[PDB]
Amino acid sequence: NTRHIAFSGNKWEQKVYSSHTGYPGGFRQVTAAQLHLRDPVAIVKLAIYGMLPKNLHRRTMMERLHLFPDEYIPEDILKNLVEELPQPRKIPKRLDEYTQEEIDAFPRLWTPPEDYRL
């Protein structure tokens, strides 16, 4: 589900990935949103690549990294899986997801005047 990552703040629009093709005029700067639309794995791959130690083992390590844009995973990879790591960020619930019991449990904060359009 690397396609469904979430960026805090306006990083989708502000974070810029810079590359150079080597040729003159070959400097390419692409926002995170554009890079994500192009490759749904690039953002996570680049984050991991930047966090890994900058030595010759880094690409051997990156060979052990398997990124899949969506829920689908190859059968052999699935059979290899051993453990699932807890998600680092707990996803906040939406109102549509809150139960009526929970809504009721939360107190009403204020008395709205009756004569108000709302």
Partner 1 sequence: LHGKSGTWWDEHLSEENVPFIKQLVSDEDKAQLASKLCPLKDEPWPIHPWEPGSFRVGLIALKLGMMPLWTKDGQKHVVTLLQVQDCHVLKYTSKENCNGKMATLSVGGKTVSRFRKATSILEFYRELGLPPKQTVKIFNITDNAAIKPGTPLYAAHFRPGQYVDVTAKTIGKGFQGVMKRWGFKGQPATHGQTKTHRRPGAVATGDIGRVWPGTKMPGKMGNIYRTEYGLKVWRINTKHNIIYVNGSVPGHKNCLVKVKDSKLPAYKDLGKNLPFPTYFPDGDEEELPEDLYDENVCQPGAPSITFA
Partner 2 sequence: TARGTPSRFLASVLHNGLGRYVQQLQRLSFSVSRDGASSRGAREFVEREVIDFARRNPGVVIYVNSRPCCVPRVVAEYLNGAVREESIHCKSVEEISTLVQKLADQSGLDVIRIRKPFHTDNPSIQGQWHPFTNKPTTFRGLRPREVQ
Partner RNA sequence: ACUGAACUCCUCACACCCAAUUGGACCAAUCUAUCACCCUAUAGAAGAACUAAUGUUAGUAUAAGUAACAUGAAAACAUUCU
Partner RNA sequence: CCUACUUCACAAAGCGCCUUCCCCCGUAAAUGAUAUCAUCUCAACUUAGUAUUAUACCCACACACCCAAGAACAGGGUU
Within residues 12-71, the interface with RNA by CB under 7 A covers 30, 33-34, 37-38
Binding-site member from 76, 83, 97, 115 for partner 2 (CB under 8 A): 83
Q: What is the rounded (10 degree) CA torsion for 38, 40, 65, 88? A: 140
The DSSP result for 41-57, as a single string, is: THHHHHHHHHHS-SSTH
Within residues 7-46, the interface with partner 1 by CB under 8 A covers 22-24
Q: How many residues does the chain have?
A: 118
**72 contributes a contact to partner 1 by CB under 8 A:** no
- Binding interface with partner 2 (CB under 8 A): 73, 78-79, 81-84
